[PDB]
Amino acid sequence: LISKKRKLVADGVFYAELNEFFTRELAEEGYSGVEVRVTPTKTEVIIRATRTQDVLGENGRRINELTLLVQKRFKYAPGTIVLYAERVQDRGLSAVAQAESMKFKLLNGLA
């Protein structure tokens, strides 16, 4: 239905949209990054971060309503989007995590 020329740009725009939404709504919770995996009738998105349990929340309601978020946003099939959380290895080697930690320290209020 779409030529691959516009389709690649559309996929890039969708990935940018998911990354920007996650970093805007998850700045307080220490978001680091997102990766994707496409398979027939299923799209897995994995959030690389530090506090996997905290971004999971209580009974995973956070991830359930985030999946519903991405669903109602991008108008895919119902229930074909699944997100997981993974603890980033070498956490301090990413500038985003260091920036988030410094934001937290500034909020605490040390020199």
């Binding site: 691959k4 020329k5 389709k7 690649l8 740009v9 990766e35 994707v36 995996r37 496409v38």
Partner: protein, 100 residues
Amino acid sequence: IKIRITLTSTKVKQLENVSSNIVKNAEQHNLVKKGPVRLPTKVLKISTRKTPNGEGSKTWETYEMRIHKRYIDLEAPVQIVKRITQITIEPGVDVEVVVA
């Protein structure tokens, strides 16, 4: 059946290795096929202003997007196609199946 497995990726090395493993699996399965034909890689160019407003010398930038298309002509049943796709999997590689 004359199926066409088409890869529409951008990762050059990933496209090369996935084509290599597909062709090597076809060779080791000893089934007739056509060679992996590469469509010429297409460059998407955006010429945009370096600066937001109209200050400074007229300077522009050319963003580039290299996209690689390739296809292999096979003849396999649905189960064999699914097993081929499942084996040698790599995220990001965009695969699609057509029948001629």
